[PDB]
Every structure is written in C-alpha cells, then in structure tokens.
Amino acid sequence: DKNGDGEVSFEE
C-alpha cells in the first residue's frame, strides 16, 4: 500500500 489506503497501491 504505497499510499496508506490499504489497497495494494504498488505495495502491500
């Protein structure tokens, strides 16, 4: 989550 929205925003 490269944003902090939980979603796998290019991360996780």
Curated annotation (Swiss-Prot):
Ca(2+) 2 binds at residues 1, 3, 5, 7, 12. It comes from the Eukaryota. This is Protein S100-G. The chain holds residues 58 to 69 of 79 of the full protein.
